[PDB]
Amino acid sequence: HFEPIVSLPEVEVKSGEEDEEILFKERAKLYRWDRDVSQWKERGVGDIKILWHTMKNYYRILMRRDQVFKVCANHVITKTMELKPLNVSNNALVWTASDYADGEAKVEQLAVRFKTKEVADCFKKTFEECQQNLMKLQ
Amino acid sequence: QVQFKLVLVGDGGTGKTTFVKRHLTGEFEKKYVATLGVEVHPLVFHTNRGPIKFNVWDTAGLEKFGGLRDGYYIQAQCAIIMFDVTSRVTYKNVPNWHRDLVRVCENIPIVLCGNKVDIKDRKVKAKSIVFHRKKNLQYYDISAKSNYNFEKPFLWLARKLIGDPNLEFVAMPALAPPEVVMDPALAAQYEHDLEVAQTTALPDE
Amino acid sequence: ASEDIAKLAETLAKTQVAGGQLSFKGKSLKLNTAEDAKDVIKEIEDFDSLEALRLEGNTVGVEAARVIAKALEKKSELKRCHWSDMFTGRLRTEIPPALISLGEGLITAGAQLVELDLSDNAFGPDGVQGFEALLKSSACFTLQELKLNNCGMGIGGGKILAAALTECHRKSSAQGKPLALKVFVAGRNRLENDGATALAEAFRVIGTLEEVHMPQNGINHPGITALAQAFAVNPLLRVINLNDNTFTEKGAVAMAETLKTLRQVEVINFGDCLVRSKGAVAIADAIRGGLPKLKELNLSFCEIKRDAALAVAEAMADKAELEKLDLNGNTLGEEGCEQLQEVLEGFNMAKVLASLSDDEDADVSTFLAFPSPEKLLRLGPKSSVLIAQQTDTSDPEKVVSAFLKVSSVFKDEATVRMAVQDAVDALMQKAFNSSSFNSNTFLTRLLVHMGLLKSEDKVKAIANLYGPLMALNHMVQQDYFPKALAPLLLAFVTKPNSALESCSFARHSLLQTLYKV
Ligand SMILES: Nc1nc2c(ncn2[C@@H]2O[C@H](COP(=O)(O)OP(=O)(O)OP(=O)(O)O)[C@@H](O)[C@H]2O)c(=O)[nH]1
Ligand SMILES: [Mg+2]
Numbered sequence: 001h002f003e004p005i006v007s008l009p010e011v012e013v014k015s016g017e018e019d020e021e022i023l024f025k026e027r028a029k030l031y032r033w034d035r036d037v038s039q040w041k042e043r044g045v046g047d048i049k050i051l052w053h054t055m056k057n058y059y060r061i062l063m064r065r066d067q068v069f070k071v072c073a074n075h076v077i078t079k080t081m082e083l084k085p086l087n088v089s090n091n092a093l094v095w096t097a098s099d100y101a102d103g104e105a106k107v108e109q110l111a112v113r114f115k116t117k118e119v120a121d122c123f124k125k126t127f128e129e130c131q132q133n134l135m136k137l138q
Numbered sequence: 139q140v141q142f143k144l145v146l147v148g149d150g151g152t153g154k155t156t157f158v159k160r161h162l163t164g165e166f167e168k169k170y171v172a173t174l175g176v177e178v179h180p181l182v183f184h185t186n187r188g189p190i191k192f193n194v195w196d197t198a199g200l201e202k203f204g205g206l207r208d209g210y211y212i213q214a215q216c217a218i219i220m221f222d223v224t225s226r227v228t229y230k231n232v233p234n235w236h237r238d239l240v241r242v243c244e245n246i247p248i249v250l251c252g253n254k255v256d257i258k259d260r261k262v263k264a265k266s267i268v269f270h271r272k273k274n275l276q277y278y279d280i281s282a283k284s285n286y287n288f289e290k291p292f293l294w295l296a297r298k299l300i301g302d303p304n305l306e307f308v309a310m311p312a313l314a315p316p317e318v319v320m321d322p323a324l325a326a327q328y329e330h331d332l333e334v335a336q337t338t339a340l341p342d343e
Numbered sequence: 344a345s346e347d348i349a350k351l352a353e354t355l356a357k358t359q360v361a362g363g364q365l366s367f368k369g370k371s372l373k374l375n376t377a378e379d380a381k382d383v384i385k386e387i388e389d390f391d392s393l394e395a396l397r398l399e400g401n402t403v404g405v406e407a408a409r410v411i412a413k414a415l416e417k418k419s420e421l422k423r424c425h426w427s428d429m430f431t432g433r434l435r436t437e438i439p440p441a442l443i444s445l446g447e448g449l450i451t452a453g454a455q456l457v458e459l460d461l462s463d464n465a466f467g468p469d470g471v472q473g474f475e476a477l478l479k480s481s482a483c484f485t486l487q488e489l490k491l492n493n494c495g496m497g498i499g500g501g502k503i504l505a506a507a508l509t510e511c512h513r514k515s516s517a518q519g520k521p522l523a524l525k526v527f528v529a530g531r532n533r534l535e536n537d538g539a540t541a542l543a544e545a546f547r548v549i550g551t552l553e554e555v556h557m558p559q560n561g562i563n564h565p566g567i568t569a570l571a572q573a574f575a576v577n578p579l580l581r582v583i584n585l586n587d588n589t590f591t592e593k594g595a596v597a598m599a600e601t602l603k604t605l606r607q608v609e610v611i612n613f614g615d616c617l618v619r620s621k622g623a624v625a626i627a628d629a630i631r632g633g634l635p636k637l638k639e640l641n642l643s644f645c646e647i648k649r650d651a652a653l654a655v656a657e658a659m660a661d662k663a664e665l666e667k668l669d670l671n672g673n674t675l676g677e678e679g680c681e682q683l684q685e686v687l688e689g690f691n692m693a694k695v696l697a698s699l700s701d702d703e704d705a706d707v708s709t710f711l712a713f714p715s716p717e718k719l720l721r722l723g724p725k726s727s728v729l730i731a732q733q734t735d736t737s738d739p740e741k742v743v744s745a746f747l748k749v750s751s752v753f754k755d756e757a758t759v760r761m762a763v764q765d766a767v768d769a770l771m772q773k774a775f776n777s778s779s780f781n782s783n784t785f786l787t788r789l790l791v792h793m794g795l796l797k798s799e800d801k802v803k804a805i806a807n808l809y810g811p812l813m814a815l816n817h818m819v820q821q822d823y824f825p826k827a828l829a830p831l832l833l834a835f836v837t838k839p840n841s842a843l844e845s846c847s848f849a850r851h852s853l854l855q856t857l858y859k860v
Contacts, residue, residue, distance in 0.1 A: 001274060002247055004301025005215065006140060008187040016313040033335050040340050044164040045285065064310060065164065067289045068183065071312045072164055078318055082332070088339040096332055100315040107328050109335045113342075150465070150495040151533040151561070170533045172467035172495035175434040200465035200495040206371055206402055206431040226615045226644065227531070227559040227587045259589045259617055261644065 017051060020060070024050040024126045026119050030063055030073050033109035040111060044072035048112060050126055059130040061097070073110060075099050079135055083127050091117040093124060142299055144192045145211060147235050148220030149228040150199035153253040156282045157220065158196050166283060166341075173198045176210050183292060186308050190296060203238045211242035216295045223252045223279070229262050232269055247298040249276050249291045256281040345638060345666060362392035368399040374407030383407075384414045393418045398429040408441030412448025421454040428463035438466065439473035446477030455485045462492040462528075471500035478507045484515040488526040492556070495531070501538020504529075505545040512548050523551040530558040539566035543573035552577045558586040567594035575601040580608055586641070587615040595622020599629035609636050614643045614669065623651040627658035637662050643697075644672035649679040656683055660690040669697040676704045707733045711745070716752040716759055726762060731769040739785040742774045746814065747792055753810030764817045775823045786828050794842050795835045808842055812849035819856050826860065833857045
């Protein structure tokens with residue numbers, strides 16, 4: 001029907017995961033804390049993953065939205081992380097992180113809710129194991 | 139870069155601002171705060187042909203038609219006419235919005251979006267939607283709440299503008315974060331937020 | 344529709360030849376600056392008696408709003424202000440300021456605001472906060488109509504408006520002249536349940552309402568029950584318009600409960616309300632129980648079934664002053680429509696119901712044989728003499744036949760006509776320069792063949808005389824044509840005939856040429 005207005009040649013797609021190993025990948029919902037209104041606002045729904053690099057040897061939490069495939073959470077794991085269960089609700093975790101999703105660092109309290117409880121337990125165990133591996137390197 | 143001024147038009151209370159916010163932040167603004175004038179929101183998508191940007195002019199549906207708002211439509215290249223599935227009065231106005239758009243911009247990809255398809259008491263049905271057949275439009279059911287076909291309109295508009303029928307979204311060009319940085323001056327404040335974070339429940343329905 | 348004529352009468356009642364309404368409707372003025380509103384303020388100042396101000400279809404900025412408010416400060420007789428759609432294009436930082444400035448101007452002026460319309464302005468909670476100051480103040484103790492259609496208030500705006508209305512009623516009662524609202528039009532604002540309940544509470548205080556419109560508010564049954572309970576108190580209700588909400592079934596039952604106790608309702612619009620064929624039965628019972636003065640009742644697109652439709656029709660028929668019933672869009676069978684029509688015509692009306700249009704359930708001889716325009720061209724310049732040479736000109740009959748065949752393919756195309764005319768000239772030049780050739784015989788045969796004259800042996804005539812007439816017209820202007828055959832052609836061309844009136848232009852040109860000589 002309508003004639004084209006702009007022609008774009010096909011380009012290669014490079015996602016920063018070729019040289020990293022996926023130690024975890026599960027469906028989840030990510031919520032960001034909104035201090036101005038003091039209520040949780042949905043940040044997205046998608047596959048949250050805990051990637052680990054081989055040479056640089058760093059652990060990175062990554063997440064992409066469902067259909068648009070935008071990055072809704074992306075940060076590094078540090079010994080100062082305080083992942084802990086959320087008293088209200090169930091099978092949910094909360095932690096503060098210097099998220100680098102949109103355009104720059106922002107200190108955000110992220111709450112992740114999984115489908116069931118065993119998945120959340122596995123995620124917490126992997127998080128703790130990554131923290132311990134980072135700490136023991138010293 | 140590539141920019142395609144998109145115009146989001148529809149009756150008041152249909153979900154234009156909620157649609158744009160769910161696209162650019164992922165949240166779900168369940169409060170009805172009527173948009174005044176026009177709001178410009180850039181949405182950056184990545185496709186197999188590279189990155190594109192849609193400058194969504196979310197217009198206010200409460201205003202009347204006429205030339206007073208033609209400033210919104212000047213130099214437009216794609217339009218999304220949004221109507222509420224659970225309200226026939228809002229569907230009766232789709233012809234008026236289409237006429238108002240084609241008055242200023244004659245031939246442009248126009249997508250009809252039926253919003254709020256997750257509610258059980260549905261008034262407008264797939265059989266009664268006959269306007270898009272008379273003209274040359276693409277009709278899509280969307281739901282900014284449950285994320286049902288909430289990116290199909292943008293995909294179709296990109297397909298018709300770029301000119302590649304087989305265009306589809308690629309994952310992302312996301313690279314590693316620059317470096318961990320913290321400011322101990324405000325660090326305590328951050329902790330305080332967590333002390334309140336655990337004291338509120340997630341918006342779970 | 345009696346509503347149209349009622350509105351027409353109301354509009355007629357408020358037209359004056361002088362000292363009346365001042366309007367700017369349909370001017371698209373962009374009052375973006377104080378100076379840019381110089382004409383508007385100058386016109387407002389130069390007005391003897393002001394009793395209405397329309398600013399529809401304009402764009403009032405903050406500075407223009409302040410200037411107009413300062414101008415209005417003088418006008419103390421103002422009683423109405425239709426400000427429908429006077430902020431098209433302004434952002435959120437410019438509407439509340441302008442609205443507050445206008446409210447302050449009216450308050451300091453000392454008006455009475457019998458009517459206050461703000462339809463089609465994108466306000467939301469911000470605009471509601473903006474004009475709440477005007478609504479509460481003494482300028483709206485006498486207010487009788489408050490049209491806020493399509494203001495897009497929302498839940499917060501609805502709550503604020505309800506609080507303002509309650510405070511205004513309290514202050515007015517304290518003064519001694521309680522607020523008596525008559526028409527309230529708040530549609531398309533998404534007052535889903537909190538706003539609807541707040542406004543129902545506001546209505547419960549005021550017992551003077553007569554009309555209430557809340558279409559397209561996304562109200563569900565939990566709020567509609569409260570709205571119906573609030574309506575029940577008001578005994579003077581006349582129009583109950585709640586088009587395009589969601590009553591399901593509980594809402595319809597609650598509405599029937601109040602309709603039982605109301606005895607002055609005249610219009611009941613419940614289109615697109617999803618009554619679902621049970622609330623239809625409840626409403627039918629309520630109206631049957633007694634509800635005179637009813638003029639309209641709309642249940643279109645309520646997904647009503649056949650039996651409930653028949654029940655409501657039977658209940659409605661007993662009404663005396665019924666003037667319109669709508670059931671289009673309900674899932675009525677094709678036989679259901681016929682049954683409903685039969686039931687209605689069993690009564691006097693028989694036509695009150697609206698149309699149920701939406702329901703669900705070497706080659707010279709070869710050319711001469713069959714002459715054609717293109718075949719003549721192929722001969723080239725040879726056609727000038729080839730036709731003349733081939734034709735036997737001793738006998739006028741063959742000359743006439745050749746002339747007719749040549750002229751039959753005559754066309755207005757420049758190349759073809761010239762070839763035809765030169766061929767004809769050559770043929771007649773060879774024909775007329777023969778002692779053994781009587782011209783009168785040729786003319787008589789030509790007239791006979793064209794049908795203008797009859798013959799001893801009936802030779803079949805030709806169909807179209809355009810070509811022969813054009814060829815004759817050309818021939819008459821040549822020298823070889825005798826000056827004695829002109830009268831015969833003139834007499835038989837002015838001679839009436841059906842075959843000639845078909846080609847009027849050729850006949851007229853030939854006659855002019857003949858009268859030249
Ligand atoms: N149930 C349901 N409600 C929705 C959905 N999408 C939007 N809504 C509701 O619709 C309302 C739309 O609000 P807004 O988008 O901010 O208003 P708008 O669409 O811009 O309308 P205007 O500002 O007047 O042009 C929201 O308050 C939501 O509660 C949906 O997918 N499902
Ligand atoms: Mg809006």
